[PDB]
Design a protein around this ligand. Structure first.
Ligand SMILES: Brc1cnc2c(NCc3cncnc3)cc(-c3ccccc3)cn12
Length: 276
């Protein structure tokens, strides 16, 4: 760690704090995550080091010293949460929303093909640069707003589909400029989802009633139309969103399939206006 000069804290990760730092030697500016060691964690983290893709934040180095664990990542200047707040008056242009969604799906498709899940996607961990790129941060390391219903209902062996759900929630949020399901407790999160998408049943989600935390006593709400949920998103966008928000994880669209959706027929790569 003495090889690094901390510049400033850039947030509080799930395991440790993240700092912008300078490699006293190389001169490199990086993001340093201090975790906060199990041999299994060491080995697992080491494998993530080989998982390289344009839309995944590069894990540069893993430093286990003093029985301490630091993760050195490439540094990006802004995150999507800040960008969304900055764009709150006018909203992010549709072409940029589409480009970002497309890139994130490419990132997920890659991770998922390698059997790596994110599990905790949220705007704060989607990082952007001046070139119009967006990257997933914290993939494989593992607010309730983005949590998939199967996680809330106590499924222990959830799948890659949880990331598609989180990303669909983020897509909606970019479009409307409001969080889709801003729950403040696990039950409030679940019920917010039910109020909008309808209380799930065996018809739309076989096996739902046998899940660990399902209760027959859950209120039965009817489903709302997406036209009410994400105006003014066009029919291609609404159709994709609906697929990303399917209750049954086995029915939910995969990242790979989503990339082929008609919504992306006219995708481009615009450059955002960033104030750093
Ligand atoms: Br790896 C990594 C590489 N760059 C970031 C980064 N940069 C955005 C930023 C830059 N300067 C100041 N504030 C934010 C934020 C977070 C992060 C922050 C909070 C939670 C999760 C991830 C992780 N990062």
């Amino acid at each position: 760690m003495e090889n690094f000069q901390k510049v400033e804290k850039i947030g509080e990760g799930t395991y440790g704090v993240v700092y912008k730092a300078r490699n006293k030697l190389t001169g490199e500016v990086v993001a340093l995550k201090k975790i906060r060691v199990p041999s299994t964690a060491i080995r697992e983290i080491s494998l993530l080091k080989e998982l390289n893709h344009p839309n995944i934040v590069k894990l540069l180095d893993v430093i286990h010293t003093e029985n301490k664990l630091y993760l050195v990542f490439e540094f990006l200047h802004q995150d999507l949460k800040k960008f969304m707040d900055a764009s709150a008056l006018t909203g992010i242009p549709l072409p940029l929303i589409k480009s970002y969604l497309f890139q994130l799906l490419q990132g997920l498709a890659f991770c998922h093909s390698h059997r790596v899940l994110h599990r905790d996607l949220k705007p704060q961990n989607l990082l952007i640069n001046t070139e119009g790129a967006i990257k997933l941060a914290d993939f494989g390391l593992a607010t309730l707003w983005y949590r998939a219903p199967e996680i809330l209902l106590g499924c222990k062996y959830y799948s890659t589909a949880v990331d598609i759900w989180s990303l669909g929630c983020i897509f909606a949020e970019m479009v409307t400029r409001r969080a889709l399901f801003p729950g403040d407790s696990e039950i409030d999160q679940l019920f917010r989802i039910f109020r909008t998408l309808g209380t799930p049943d065996e018809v739309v989600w076989p096996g739902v009633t046998s899940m660990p935390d399902y209760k027959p006593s859950f209120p039965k709400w009817a489903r709302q139309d997406f036209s009410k949920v994400v105006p003014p998103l066009d029919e291609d966008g609404r159709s994709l969103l609906s697929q990303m928000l399917h209750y049954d994880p086995n029915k939910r669209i995969s990242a790979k399939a989503a990339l082929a959706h008609p919504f992306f027929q006219d995708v481009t790569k615009p450059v955002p206006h960033l104030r750093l």
